[PDB]
Write an enzyme that holds these catalytic residues in place. Structure first.
Site, PDB file in Angstrom:
ATOM      1  CD  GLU A  18      -5.115  -4.766  -4.128  1.00 37.25           C
ATOM      2  OE1 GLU A  18      -5.310  -4.043  -3.124  1.00 37.25           O
ATOM      3  OE2 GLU A  18      -4.054  -5.398  -4.315  1.00 37.25           O
ATOM      4  CB  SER A  58      -1.014  -0.128   1.136  1.00 38.99           C
ATOM      5  OG  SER A  58      -2.106   0.751   0.943  1.00 38.99           O
ATOM      6  CG  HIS A 115      -5.500  -2.657  -0.083  1.00 35.50           C
ATOM      7  ND1 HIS A 115      -4.486  -2.606  -1.015  1.00 35.50           N
ATOM      8  CD2 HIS A 115      -5.211  -1.701   0.836  1.00 35.50           C
ATOM      9  CE1 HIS A 115      -3.620  -1.669  -0.672  1.00 35.50           C
ATOM     10  NE2 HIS A 115      -4.031  -1.113   0.455  1.00 35.50           N
TER      11      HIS A 115
END
Length: 566
Positions: free
Chosen positions: A347, A214, A467
């Site tokens: 995600e 990230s 994610h």
């Protein structure tokens, strides 16, 4: 986050404290550093592996007083032995579960972990840079436990860096020496420390790999782009992000005044008076008010965070980002090191609870104009060309008669992760000399082993690989439990850490020693490839055409008449 989850989290915090006592041995050890000796402690894992743990190693002077908002300065050496048997505080931030401000300005530390301080062979050094949108995160082992990596003969290092306004304030006035990116400059100084000191812990300074997820992936990419780090490391892994993602930088030079005003400033908008006020403020006050800094106009324009990585307005000795990252790619030293990139298979499931709080967000899919890249859209988003581009986005993601929340989340996967990855791959092939890039896709779904990010998205009972769901297979955390050797989760831990270590060692992620990899032919992406291939990690390891490729191509088609901007 619900009150029930908050109670369960508090219970887990307490139980984790006593588990960590039971995992502490009575064996301590001293290692050397360029600044003085450090004392670490031997710890166990629940699998009865063991490792030497050094936490709280300073790589910079505490950025307090006149050093607030400045580039990091080299730390003061010491005589005697610095106690590194416990963690230090995290950077000042709003706790992701409790909602309260926590941490300290005294946060410029790294942690080093290895199963053997005097090995027979110098070891690959893996350096993890955590995510958290440049506003949260830490190197504490309740989220980033080295327990899985230390099964193998590597050195693992987890860094901290300044967050929020304290890490990312930027002012135009050259006289004030606050150009921005202090938190990225912290990363630079940590990487320099690692190069100069990892050999004292059994590491190979000629074989350093930086990886992050990230915002940690955007950070790793920034570390591969900036001249400040040229030649400091030798492989990079970008997990669900990069430095040209739209969320990864912002021009925030005008926002210091707004923050100051929220914090009680009574003067005019000039950088000098604004800075003097901010230098006197309590750090908790600045961080707590950051959520209020974005204006109505900036929220309208979908700016995500007020402070973050920025293109610096003037040059300094420590300057990290002298131009936009897209331009930096064209001359970047890190284009010439082995690189691996990937994402999860869903995600955008991250946005599950946001869509629950604002169901009307699905109405943005009616025309999709708000998702058109800003460099292609007219300001009012009413031009026929912009409507046409929005219609192409809509065709890619709206699969039924009415747009759904899942359509929205699928769009989010592309705008934030897959499309920037594609744009980066295509940009970079124009500025590299054949150095290989390898793609993975993390596609392993389980709720038997989780990480605290699932609590953030209110993801209990939600199927799909969101994610940050892969972090469970790289790091031990306070929600984890010992899993049976034959379990699908245990095997995924071995495969993910194994692949990362193999890539860190050789620059090629394939090894016939990883279970289920034997029949894998994993080639890197070529400039001539029209369809990307990736290693898909599910219960099996399989090379596949990236399933997202068709949608990626639909996004790319918006640039057909504007190829110079792609």
């Amino acid at each position: 986050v619900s009150l029930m989850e908050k109670l369960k989290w508090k219970i887990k915090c307490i139980e984790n404290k006593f588990l960590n006592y039971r995992l502490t041995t009575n064996e301590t050890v001293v290692a050397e550093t360029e600044y003085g000796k450090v004392k670490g402690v031997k710890r166990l894992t629940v699998y009865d592996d063991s490792y030497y743990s050094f936490e709280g190693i300073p790589y910079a002077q505490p950025p307090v007083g006149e050093l607030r908002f400045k580039a990091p300065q080299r730390p003061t050496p010491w005589d005697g032995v610095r106690d590194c048997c416990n963690h230090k505080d995290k950077s000042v931030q709003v706790d992701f579960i409790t909602g309260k401000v926590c941490g300290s300005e005294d946060c410029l530390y790294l942690s080093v972990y290895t199963n053997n301080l005097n090995p027979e062979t110098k070891r690959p050094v893996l350096v993890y840079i955590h995510g958290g949108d440049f506003i949260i995160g830490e190197n504490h082992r309740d989220m980033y436990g080295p327990d899985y990596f230390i099964k193998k003969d590597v050195v693992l290092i987890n860094i901290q860096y300044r967050l929020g306004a304290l890490g990312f304030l930027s002012l135009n006035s050259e006289d004030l020496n606050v150009p921005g990116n202090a938190g990225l400059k912290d990363q630079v100084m940590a990487l320099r420390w690692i190069k100069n000191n990892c050999a004292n812990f059994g590491g190979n300074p000629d074989n350093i790999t930086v990886f992050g997820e990230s915002a940690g992936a955007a950070s790793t990419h920034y570390m591969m782009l900036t001249e400040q780090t040229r030649g400091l490391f030798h492989r990079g892994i970008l997990m669900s992000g990069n430095a040209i993602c739209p969320w990864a930088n912002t021009q925030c030079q005008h926002r210091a005044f707004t923050l100051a005003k929220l914090a009680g400033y009574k003067g005019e908008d000039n950088d000098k008076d604004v800075l003097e006020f901010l230098m006197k403020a309590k750090p908790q006050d600045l961080i707590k008010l950051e959520e209020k800094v974005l204006t109505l106009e900036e929220r309208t324009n979908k700016v995500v965070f007020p402070f973050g990585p920025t293109v610096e307005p003037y040059q300094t000795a420590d300057c990290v980002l002298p131009k936009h990252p897209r331009e930096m790619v064209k001359t970047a030293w890190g284009n010439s090191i082995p690189t691996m990139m990937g994402n999860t298979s869903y995600e955008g499931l991250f946005f599950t609870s946001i869509l629950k709080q604002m169901p009307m967000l699905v109405k943005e899919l009616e025309t999709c104009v708000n998702f058109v890249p800003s460099e292609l859209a007219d300001v009012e988003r009413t031009a026929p060309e912009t409507l046409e581009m929005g219609a192409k986005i809509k065709k890619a993601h709206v699969t039924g008669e009415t747009p759904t929340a899942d359509n929205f989340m699928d769009l989010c996967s592309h705008i934030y992760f897959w499309f920037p990855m594609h744009r980066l791959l295509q940009l970079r092939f124009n500025h590299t000399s054949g150095t290989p890039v390898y793609l993975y896709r993390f596609d392993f779904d389980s709720e038997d082993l989780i990480n605290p990010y699932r609590i953030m998205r209110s993801g209990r009972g939600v199927k799909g690989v969101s994610h940050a769901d892969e972090l469970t297979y790289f790091f031990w955390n306070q929600l984890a439990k010992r899993m049976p050797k034959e379990s699908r989760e245990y095997k995924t831990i071995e495969r993910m850490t194994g692949i990362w270590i193999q890539f860190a060692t050789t620059g090629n992620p394939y090894s016939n020693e990883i279970e289920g990899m034997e029949n894998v032919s994993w080639d890197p992406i070529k400039k001539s490839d029209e369809v990307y291939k990736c290693l898909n990690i599910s219960d099996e390891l399989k090379m596949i055409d990236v399933p997202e490729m068709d949608k990626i191509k639909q996004w790319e088609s918006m640039f057909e008449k504007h190829r110079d901007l792609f």
